[PDB]
Amino acid sequence: NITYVNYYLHQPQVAAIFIISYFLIFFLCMMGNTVVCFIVMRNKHMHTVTNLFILNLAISDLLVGIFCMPITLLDNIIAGWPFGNTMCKISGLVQGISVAASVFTLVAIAVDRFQCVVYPFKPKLTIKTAFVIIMIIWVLAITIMSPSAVMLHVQEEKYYRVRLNSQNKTSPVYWCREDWPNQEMRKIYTTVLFANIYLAPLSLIVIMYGRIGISLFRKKQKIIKMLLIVALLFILSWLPLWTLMMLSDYADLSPNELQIINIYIYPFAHWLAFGNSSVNPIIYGFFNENFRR
């Protein structure tokens, strides 16, 4: 029995959650990041070197906003990627580049913050050094992600079909799934990614901000709160993500389970994931006052 699913992958009333929530995250992740771009190109003391890093994160979040969350927006309510294979792979690759770049600039910003405080006297950096780091982040955002774009293409479900919204008639589905000829080895590529993108960044972001905390008490409580809030954001906002994707290559789920999670809870997971990019500009712009002036 060829699976004739409905074109509308959710209830028309249920889809309201997806559209409205993604609209809320989109409006701010777009406007706030455009403003953050503007604030750095508005004053002569924004030509300093740290604002290169906050611009790194601003551009990363701008790419997230433009591509990534609309990409998952299409994937949820409606059926297989209709823009075509080339577009689907390009969009999926932008997704990975953006995510990796965001986490890497979080790590780099934490590095920069750490060096400034833990050691009072330090010739920390210059335009050249920080620029090099920016580009290093970008290379690693492409390289650690290269195995992702290595195998994507389009999985022609075929066994599954769609009730075309025009007349609720048959319409074979071809989602933009990964065409991995060596699917077996990918069960650990996700494991390496889990470490490299969540824990190694989580480990670092823990140690540097923690050491800043101890060094600073050895009036200003706003920055102490800033440190903890930023740490918790990456601790419990990208938390369910890796849990979910790792679960795929780990303990298998029931069929009904896999259906329920991958259909309804995973969009919520992506909401939290893109929430990091959406909350990055407010946090790193209003927590500072060299921009608030």
Partner: peptide, 7 residues
Amino acid sequence: PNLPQRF
């Protein structure tokens, strides 16, 4: 079916 796009 569909496995949501990685990140």
